[PDB]
Subunit: 114 residues, 2 copies
Amino acid sequence: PGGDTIFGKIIRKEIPAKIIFEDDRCLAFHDISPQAPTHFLVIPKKHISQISVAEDDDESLLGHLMIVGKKCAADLGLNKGYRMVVNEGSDGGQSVYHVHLHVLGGRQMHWPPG
Amino acid sequence: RPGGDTIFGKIIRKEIPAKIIFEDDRCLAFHDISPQAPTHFLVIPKKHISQISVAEDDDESLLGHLMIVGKKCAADLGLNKGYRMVVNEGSDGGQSVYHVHLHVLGGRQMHWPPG
């Protein structure tokens, strides 16, 4: 495992998180510093440090994060829409080196996206 | 038709011009006409899916492929300091074209929140 980051600790249940969904290969939970009325993360249990190092063999897993994200968004009542975000590296503002998909909604999201 | 009715379908069928970065049997990557960062491109599936909220379970590999192609194109374009990937859904997401697409933005510091 889950990795040497705070997200690994969340996966291993060593620290608390408000979990929305879990299966054998991913976990969705509310972000601790929400930027919208609804703001959660979907992360793989496999420790991929950043999207730039994902491989072709990870394609289904990465798509699974997005499908889980859109299902969770619907379950959380985001019927007016939302935004999905993956941050990579310094310029991307990536805060934890464990791949994570942000899902934000419950307010108008603006443009540019940061 | 192959690619759907939106302007992105027109781009897929090469009926209107685009600055294409990458193309395969499943997707197409091209530069955005209204860039919000020094590099700003889109990765879109050739199969029409209107928005991420209606994607099917069987679309997982395709959606993942968009992200893999996005990161590969970002590397090929020299975005070595990072980038941000974005999918907009619906009104609150600010989606203006109803053909699912992944934005990739880089070449400057991206800020938080992401809109």
